[PDB]
Design a protein around this nucleic acid. Structure first.
Length: 247
DNA sequence: CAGTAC
DNA sequence: GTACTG
């Protein structure tokens, strides 16, 4: 049909943005069926197209809880020490969630290692994980997984699930980044910059060196941040609770 | 670049 | 704003 809603239709495929949607449009594709039959699909895009309807639905908060518990039980089997916290919109207290954001670390600071591969393998044997989207094994000590899960039982939709494993020393910043919101994180890091500091999912750093155009030319030194409250303090900010961060 | 995560 | 893989 008309160009704008067709671009919108294509854009709602995971792995496809405006550039891809516009390219498809030039090709003369107008429907999801057209994409399915004729378009050159990325593995991820093919998965997004297959779960198009489900991925458009936001799940009830209660379902996100079950998903996080499903992940938690599997991890704990490996080690009872593991701490799993659902982040994102769920931690911010939303009634519905676009996806489930599960963070995992271990208090001793060592046992978090070796878990990521096993946990995923465990979740696959269970039939929980249905498709894998992207894997990041190079984020320093943080491992990230993006995939598709589905709770057992009838009438269950496929849900987007992200699993991140971090060291206990980076727990606070990883928790901070991953609960958001996106605009909230954007503002905190913007502020940190003004103060000659930097904030990432890994750590908060002071004495960061920047140039005339404000381009970072040297890292500072990592400041020990055991809790979220410590990060707020070192930036001269009043602590906000997750619900207070839903910007 | 493009798309993605918050 | 920061930062990952497709």
């Amino acid at each position: 049909s008309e160009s704008v809603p067709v671009l919108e239709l294509f854009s709602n495929i995971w792995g496809a943005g405006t550039k891809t949607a516009q390219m498809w449009y030039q090709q003369g594709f107008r429907s999801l069926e057209d994409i399915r039959s004729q378009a050159s699909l990325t593995t991820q895009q093919a998965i997004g197209l297959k779960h198009y309807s489900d991925f458009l639905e936001r799940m009830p908060r209660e379902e996100a809880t079950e998903i996080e518990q499903t992940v938690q039980k599997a991890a704990q089997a490996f080690n009872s020490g593991l701490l799993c916290v659902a982040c994102g919109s769920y931690r911010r207290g939303k009634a519905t969630c676009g996806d489930v954001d599960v963070l995992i670390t271990h208090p001793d600071g060592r046992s978090h290692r070796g878990i990521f591969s096993r946990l995923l393998d465990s979740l696959r044997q269970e039939g929980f994980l249905t498709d894998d989207l992207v894997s990041q094994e190079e984020n320093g000590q943080q491992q990230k997984y993006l995939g598709v899960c589905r709770l057992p039982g009838p009438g269950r939709r496929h849900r987007r699930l992200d699993i991140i494993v971090v060291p206990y020393s980076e727990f606070a910043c990883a928790l901070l980044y991953f609960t958001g919101s996106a605009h909230f994180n954007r503002s905190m890091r913007a502020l940190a910059k003004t103060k000659g500091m930097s904030l990432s999912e890994h750590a908060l750093s002071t004495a960061v060196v920047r140039n005339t155009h404000g381009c970072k030319v040297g890292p500072g030194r990592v400041l020990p941040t055991p809790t979220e409250k410590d990060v707020f303090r070192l930036l001269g900010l009043p602590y906000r609770e997750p619900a207070e961060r839903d910007w």
